[PDB]
Design a protein around this ligand. Sequence first.
Ligand SMILES: C[C@]12CCC(=O)C[C@@H]1CC[C@@H]1[C@@H]2CC[C@]2(C)[C@@H](O)CC[C@@H]12
Length: 241
Amino acid sequence: PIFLNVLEAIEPGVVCAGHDNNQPDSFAALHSSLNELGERQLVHVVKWAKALPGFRNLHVDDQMAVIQYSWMGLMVFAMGWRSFTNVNSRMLYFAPDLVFNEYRMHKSRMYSQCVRMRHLSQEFGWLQITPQEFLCMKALLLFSIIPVDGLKNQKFFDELRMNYIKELDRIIACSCSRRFYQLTKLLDSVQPIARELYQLAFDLLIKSHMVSVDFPEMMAEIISVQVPKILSGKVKPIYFH
Ligand SMILES: C[C@]12CCC(=O)C[C@@H]1CC[C@@H]1[C@@H]2CC[C@]2(C)[C@@H](O)CC[C@@H]12
């Protein structure tokens, strides 16, 4: 069971937001802690992706491109898993120190996005997603969004992604047809959610820049340099259906 040994071995542990839960829930304080949490999780996503079977086959620039396009889908998918297992999804478990209740969903001004994220979370229960299935699905998310113009070595990407699909099929097989349909439909459903949060993240970065409040450095760079390629359609998700 080589492949699964690796995914479970490299899975990131707890990541705290740094949030001061004793100060009031303002828009500013909630988003400052969300953004800091993003910066911190980005570190772990980079280290996780580089340790994935086959990932270093990819040209070095494609390695960074793929991380820099898929991070939102990956982080939302993982957050949904955390929510499912820790508060069974009527709250959002961004981090142990940053759990969103309904009030925080409203004061962050992202209630409707949180409602979709909460729906994604609950699907882990509706579909009875196993830990092995979650891990394989999350790895596939890294290979599920690319420039329409292709990567520097697209061929290696296409083969690696093929191999991760084969692994997803393996864990299922180890009816199977309905299960693969269900899981590929779930995967496809992550991307519209990611896109909404990408739009949100971009809009807030412009607005906070207007009033001279800075995002953490990597978040500011990815949201100003890479996210707009997604919002403008130069980078697109790869769907199953
Ligand atoms: C990825 C994060 C942080 C990590 C996580 O668990 C999911 C969550 C999804 C919303 C993102 C947030 C990082 C900061 C963002 C991008 C804010 O700018 C607006 C939307 C937030």
